[PDB]
Amino acid sequence: LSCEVCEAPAERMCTACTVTYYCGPVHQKADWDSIHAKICQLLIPLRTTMPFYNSEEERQHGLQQLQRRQKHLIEFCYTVAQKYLFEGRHEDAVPAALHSLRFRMNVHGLSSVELVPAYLLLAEASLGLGRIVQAEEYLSQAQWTVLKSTDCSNATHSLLHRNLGLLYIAKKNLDEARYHLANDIYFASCAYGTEDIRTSGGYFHLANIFYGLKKMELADTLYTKVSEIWYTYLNSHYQALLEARSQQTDLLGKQFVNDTGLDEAQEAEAIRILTSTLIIQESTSTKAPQKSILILKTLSILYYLMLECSKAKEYAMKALSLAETYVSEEEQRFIQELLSVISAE
Amino acid sequence: VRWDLMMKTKEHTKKLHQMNDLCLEKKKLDSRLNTLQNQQGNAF
Amino acid sequence: KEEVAAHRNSYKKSICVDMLRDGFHKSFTELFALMEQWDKLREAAKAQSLFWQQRPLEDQPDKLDNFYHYLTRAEAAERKGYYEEVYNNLYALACYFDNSEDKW
Amino acid sequence: LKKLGKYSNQKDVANYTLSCNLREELVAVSERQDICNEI
Numbered sequence A: 001l002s003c004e005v006c007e008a009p010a011e012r013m014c015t016a017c018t019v020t021y022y023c024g025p026v027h028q029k030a031d032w033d034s035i036h037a038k039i040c041q042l043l044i045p046l047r048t049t050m051p052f053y054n055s056e057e058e059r060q061h062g063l064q065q066l067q068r069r070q071k072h073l074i075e076f077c078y079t080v081a082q083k084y085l086f087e088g089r090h091e092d093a094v095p096a097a098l099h100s101l102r103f104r105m106n107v108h109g110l111s112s113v114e115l116v117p118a119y120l121l122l123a124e125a126s127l128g129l130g131r132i133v134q135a136e137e138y139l140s141q142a143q144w145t146v147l148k149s150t151d152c153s154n155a156t157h158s159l160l161h162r163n164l165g166l167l168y169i170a171k172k173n174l175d176e177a178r179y180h181l182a183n184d185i186y187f188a189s190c191a192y193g194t195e196d197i198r199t200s201g202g203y204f205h206l207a208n209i210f211y212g213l214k215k216m217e218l219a220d221t222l223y224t225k226v227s228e229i230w231y232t233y234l235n236s237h238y239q240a241l242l243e244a245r246s247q248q249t250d251l252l253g254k255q256f257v258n259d260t261g262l263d264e265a266q267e268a269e270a271i272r273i274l275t276s277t278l279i280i281q282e283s284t285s286t287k288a289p290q291k292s293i294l295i296l297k298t299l300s301i302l303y304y305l306m307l308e309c310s311k312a313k314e315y316a317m318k319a320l321s322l323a324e325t326y327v328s329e330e331e332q333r334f335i336q337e338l339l340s341v342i343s344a345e
Numbered sequence B: 001v002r003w004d005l006m007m008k009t010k011e012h013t014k015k016l017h018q019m020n021d022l023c024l025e026k027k028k029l030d031s032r033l034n035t036l037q038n039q040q041g042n043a044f
Numbered sequence C: 001k002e003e004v005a006a007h008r009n010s011y012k013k014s015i016c017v018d019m020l021r022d023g024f025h026k027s028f029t030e031l032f033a034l035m036e037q038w039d040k041l042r043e044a045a046k047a048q049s050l051f052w053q054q055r056p057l058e059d060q061p062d063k064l065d066n067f068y069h070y071l072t073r074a075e076a077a078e079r080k081g082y083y084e085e086v087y088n089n090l091y092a093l094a095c096y097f098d099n100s101e102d103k104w
Numbered sequence D: 001l002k003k004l005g006k007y008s009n010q011k012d013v014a015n016y017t018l019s020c021n022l023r024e025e026l027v028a029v030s031e032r033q034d035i036c037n038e039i
């Protein structure tokens, strides 16, 4: 046996669960935070070896429900890992990712494409740790898998190319960074369509390269494309919510749920993208403050749909003050309406 | 006329030996893929 | 190697890769839009409409070459704001496309 | 001669087919090389 979380020794028991194994206090603490704050005990129902399911239907039922629970927690762990990578908590990401990988090994087997998402998260954490060659290990595995893969979807391959690009981005060739992110953007565009937030994430990394190249007009163009995507999606939700709340009233009445419809990890990535986009859009070209107003609107909408009320208010107030000098009344009246909705809700 | 059939057979065998060389290259690349599989082992 | 993958992948892929790799991002967006339009039309229409009589575009590399040259030029101009250069390059496409299959 | 005429035409078509076979094996060997060379 080993410390499953790192394959160092099982130096200590997981007193929370007995089933988890730690190389003493540092990984004990980090894995406690990472998986046990999220679910802790639920792994115990996974870890327990079954008693005899006595008939074919009992075996089938027990396997099906165990496996589907395993899958559900596999995906929740992978979402948690993604959020820890977006939150920068790469230490906490390392347990969550390694667990999700090992459970994918157990259900799917090492050969599966389903590991490729986890392998790429383990690259991403390694690059958060600067362990470039370690990330190259898991990208190597993924690359062989996908090159063999009989069925790799457009989204899956977009993931591969995106992380390949990120790995070279830690490397030193901007040409490769563009080449691979471009492939990611293509495969996102054909899977999702051209206005998806994930495509925009590709465009964002491309913009950051064009900013590093100081190719201000192309970088700003990419930042515009991304900002417009985020705007359009959040507008789609915000408009639909207000329109439905307006549309009709029986005497029963109703109230609709204020909702981002996002993954919390997608919300964290939205904040990371929009914030970096705003700062780079200003520093490349303060000559277009209206694009800052657009990003402030975008974030204020996101914050309202979250009910991140404090930043929703602050960023709406900023947008309104800038829009009064810079922009037509439509901008100001939208931002006033959004503030009135935040303050009422 | 038989000479033409013989020479067409000989050049056919030349293409056989070319492809057999490529089969040895494929055997090499199979051993390479197994080497990369051993890199999969993912100790940490 | 990568060049072998680029030619060995579809010419459609090859030009998409060139486009987005070299920052012709909008040129890709246009190519995607038109290619999807062609496919949609050729699938959808009534079973002997000219759209079904159209050739496959993907088979037909010279049209993708025309898209490569003119879209690369037009986006290089598009960036500038020298709108008449864009006009002239897009019209050069348009007149090249002044044929029954390319009318739309 | 007609026997050798038949087999000569057989070799004519078989050697053209073999030219396609060697093109196939050349793309096969080059792509199997590509697998190891890309990574």
Ligand SMILES: [Zn+2]
Residues within 6 Å of the ligand: A014, A016, A017, A018, A019, A020, A036, A040
């Ligand atoms: Zn535990």
Ligand SMILES: [Zn+2]
Residues within 6 Å of the ligand: A003, A006, A007, A008, A023, A027
């Ligand atoms: Zn350890």
